[PDB]
């Protein structure tokens, strides 16, 4: 019990490599069928990353329904989320039609098109106002209306059309551009600076759909993000904030998604990120201001 | 296909 002596306790001993193996002999195993078909080859990026039956994403289309994604459902925390692998040049149409379906408000991306010579992730929004893309398989048009950029992440504004049925929404882009695969951001202080500019925003809002978190295959940054996430929910509506079991938040978000958290160092991250988080939710307003200027955004 | 681990 209680995150913080635990903390020292495994830093101390070295353990961390062990405390994570375990959590991956405990995670749990459902079949991916749908993710397995031949038909659906080319809409996978990794052979060794797919969404389960029973949480995954269904597409509004007669023809195939699939998308490499899956539903995150936290029901005592009250919140949802929509973890994906980095789209596809094939898969582009389907991200946004996605979207649009889950009437979702943000979007996180914690990934860079290219990282260490390699593509991850395609082109998916335009990076010109004047050059709208559109996408011809489901109708629909994405035009960049501004973009607020500071030294570790950028803010984007998106128009998302649907031309058959002539509506129009605003989507907000949160792309976080320091962080490596298999990676650890760079310090607590940027993490949560960062994670509460989402919150601030309003699409983590039960009135919207459930924000769409990706990374390239969606599961360690993106694990990483939502279990930080989830951890300062629970210490703010139970009322005894040392019963949060991290490793249990952790396991319960591993039924929807496998894989979650890809290193020892992004569990030990999550563990830093979450007690320097608690400090602001117990009542303390003035560390948010200094995040802000540990973290160096100008 | 690839393999991400």
Same mark, same amino acid.
Request: a negative charge; hydrophobic letters at 35%; glycine letters at 4%.
């Given at each position: 019990?209680?995150?913080?002596?635990?903390?020292?306790?495994?830093?101390?001993?070295?353990?961390?490599?062990?405390?994570?193996?375990?959590? #991956?002999?405990?995670?749990?195993?459902?079949?991916? /069928?749908?993710?397995?078909?031949?038909?659906?080859?080319? #809409?996978? @990026?990794? @052979?060794?990353?797919?969404?389960?039956?029973?949480? !995954?994403?269904?597409?509004?289309?007669?023809?195939?329904?699939?998308?490499?994604?899956?539903?995150?459902?936290?029901?005592?925390?009250?919140?949802?989320?929509?973890?994906?692998?980095?789209?596809?040049? =094939?898969?582009?149409?389907? +991200?946004?039609?996605?979207?649009?379906?889950?009437?979702? @408000?943000?979007?996180?991306?914690? =990934? !860079?098109?290219?990282?260490?010579?390699?593509?991850?992730?395609?082109?998916?929004?335009?990076?010109?106002?004047? *050059?709208?893309?559109?996408?011809?398989?489901?109708?629909?048009?994405?035009? %960049?209306?501004?973009?607020?950029?500071?030294?570790?992440?950028?803010?984007?504004?998106?128009?998302?059309? =649907?031309?058959?049925?002539?509506?129009? #929404?605003?989507?907000? &882009?949160? &792309?976080?551009?320091?962080?490596?695969?298999?990676?650890?951001?760079? $310090?607590?202080?940027?993490?949560? =600076?960062?994670?509460? *500019?989402? !919150?601030?925003?309003? $699409?983590? $809002?039960?009135? &919207?759909?459930?924000?769409?978190?990706?990374?390239?295959?969606?599961?360690? #940054?993106?694990?990483?993000?939502?279990?930080?996430?989830?951890?300062?929910?629970?210490?703010?509506? !139970?009322?005894?904030?040392?019963?949060?079991?991290?490793? *249990?938040?952790?396991?319960?978000? /591993?039924?929807? @998604?496998?894989?979650?958290?890809?290193?020892?160092?992004? %569990?030990?991250?999550?563990? %830093?990120?979450?007690?320097?988080?608690?400090? +602001?939710?117990?009542?303390?307003? $003035?560390?948010?201001?200094?995040?802000?200027?540990?973290?160096?955004?100008? | 296909?690839?393999?991400?681990?």
């Amino acid at each position: 019990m209680e995150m913080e002596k635990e903390f020292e306790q495994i830093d101390k001993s070295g353990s961390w490599a062990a405390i994570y193996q375990d959590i #991956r002999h405990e995670a749990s195993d459902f079949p991916c /069928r749908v993710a397995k078909l031949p038909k659906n080859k080319n #809409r996978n @990026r990794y @052979r060794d990353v797919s969404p389960f039956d029973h949480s !995954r994403i269904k597409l509004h289309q007669e023809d195939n329904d699939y998308i490499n994604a899956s539903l995150i459902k936290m029901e005592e925390a009250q919140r949802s989320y929509i973890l994906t692998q980095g789209p596809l040049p =094939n898969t582009c149409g389907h +991200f946004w039609e996605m979207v649009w379906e889950q009437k979702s @408000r943000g979007v996180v991306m914690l =990934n !860079r098109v290219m990282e260490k010579g390699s593509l991850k992730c395609a082109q998916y929004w335009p990076q010109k106002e004047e *050059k709208e893309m559109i996408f011809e398989d489901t109708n629909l048009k994405l035009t %960049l209306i501004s973009e607020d950029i500071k030294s570790y992440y950028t803010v984007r504004q998106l128009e998302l059309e =649907n031309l058959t049925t002539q509506e129009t #929404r605003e989507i907000l &882009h949160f &792309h976080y551009t320091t962080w490596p695969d298999f990676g650890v951001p760079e $310090s607590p202080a940027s993490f949560l =600076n960062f994670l509460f *500019k989402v !919150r601030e925003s309003g $699409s983590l $809002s039960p009135e &919207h759909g459930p924000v769409v978190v990706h990374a390239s295959a969606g599961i360690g #940054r993106s694990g990483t993000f939502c279990l930080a996430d989830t951890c300062l929910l629970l210490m703010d509506k !139970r009322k005894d904030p040392s019963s949060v079991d991290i490793k *249990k938040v952790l396991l319960e978000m /591993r039924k929807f @998604r496998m894989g979650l958290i890809q290193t020892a160092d992004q %569990l030990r991250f999550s563990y %830093l990120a979450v007690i320097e988080g608690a400090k +602001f939710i117990m009542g303390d307003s $003035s560390v948010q201001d200094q995040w802000k200027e540990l973290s160096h955004e100008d | 296909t690839d393999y991400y681990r």
